[model samples]
Target: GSSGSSGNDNSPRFEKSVYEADLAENSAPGTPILQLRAADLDVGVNGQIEYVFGAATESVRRLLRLDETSGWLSVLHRIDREEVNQLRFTVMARDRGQPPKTDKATVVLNIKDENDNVP
Candidate 1:
């Protein structure tokens, strides 16, 4: 006896693998910097995607946050060029399928110098 009636599910895929942007040094907290997007061919739960930070360091976690549902990347603490000239981290999107499908994208932030330097 053999049977195969269930539909196949598609894995979630990111629109791009790398995202980069320039941020002015000393930006305040809660600043919206970037947005990530992913898509799945499946329907319903199979297509429902949630975002999370992957392999992020403590500094990165303390300085930034990613929205699970909307994939909006925002700053949690003020950024200083002298402290961190550039920031790089990975963001992942995973689906709600049985076994779950996931994809990732790298976020790169280039800090631009500001006139806040005191002489």
Candidate 2:
């Protein structure tokens, strides 16, 4: 009898752990925010990666969109700088492995002021 096991899972890793972006108020929806990248060392399906939001607030999900396959982040609605000056959240990347390896990255958004508000 021969007992052996080839158990190995490649974990996903982000190219950079932190990302930053600048946006002005009254920006149109679907405006490109930023793109994230993650890589896995496995083969075939194991190496396939998907992106998603992690531990994010309701405002984050409602105001932004993160593509699962493309890792593209975009605005979902017009943002007001007076309402919120900045946004910080986490993005996660997971691989299609048996156990599914995942990694996280931080995204920071700086909202710029517009001339809509006046004293």
Candidate 3:
């Protein structure tokens, strides 16, 4: 519909993109860490928009993977807070536009330590 706020033909912006997730260290693989909803995003040109996911840091880059088409953030491996209690990363989104415009939201993961499970 070309209902973009920007002067361009198609513009996309992220609203409420930044997110924080608190999860237990015991969470298993393939567990959903967070939902990167494209609803909060504005696609200036509404025509079967597609989403591409990217990250903002190497600190936790290999720890998670984003469902590029759905923007679903999931854990890629086990989490041990003893090594890193917190992780901060950005979810970068882009449409299938030729000259793709991207918007990123910060995601902070606070891993809760299993104090009682101390070996």
Candidate 4:
């Protein structure tokens, strides 16, 4: 009944999104890790994407603080390569719709061990 048409004018749907950010194994204190806006997870404004990160109660899960309104992600503490070299977290996104569509994204912090402090 239609040609070259997807029908829905709401743009393509995003089932789920994943993000990976890198940092120096010996990253300095107060260094900006990553900023995850709503657009970072999904494009096209079907509705405002409300992002909530780490609702679970755990160690690695509570390692980051996320700004729900902006969807920004930041490291909670220093990354000591001597202690560890990896970190991980997740963000749950929900669209403000009638039924409210939901999605989750996994954010990985891969600390590349370069250790410039005296490698």
Highest lDDT against the true fold, candidate:
1
lDDT of 3 by residue, 31-116 (tens): 78877765534533464444454565664666666777666788888877787878877766676565576767777788876665
Q: lDDT for each of the candidates?
A: 0.80, 0.79, 0.67, 0.60
- The stretch of ten residues in a row with the least summed lDDT in candidate 3 is 40-49
Candidate 4 wrongly placed segments (more than 4 Å)? 1-16, 40-47, 54-57, 97-99, 114-119
Q: How many backbone collisions does model 4 have?
A: 0
Q: State which candidate has the highest TM-score.
A: 1
**Model 2 Cα lDDT, one tens digit per residue, 2-56:** 9875776566787778888777766777888888877553334433788989879
Question: By descending lDDT, how would the candidates be arranged?
Answer: 1, 2, 3, 4
State the lDDT at 45 in candidate 2. 48
Candidate 2 wrong stretches, greater than 4 Å: 1-9, 40-47, 96-99, 114-119
Consecutive 10-residue window with the lowest summed lDDT within model 1:
39-48
Give the clashing residue pairs of candidate 3, or none. Answer: none
- Whole-model lDDT, candidate 1? 0.80
Per-candidate TM equals 0.78, 0.77, 0.70, 0.61
Q: Which pairs, if any, clash in model 4?
A: none
Q: lDDT per residue, candidate 4, 1-119, as tens digits? A: 56684554332222435578887765554466777655534335655666676344465544556666766666566667655576666667776555555556777778776645564
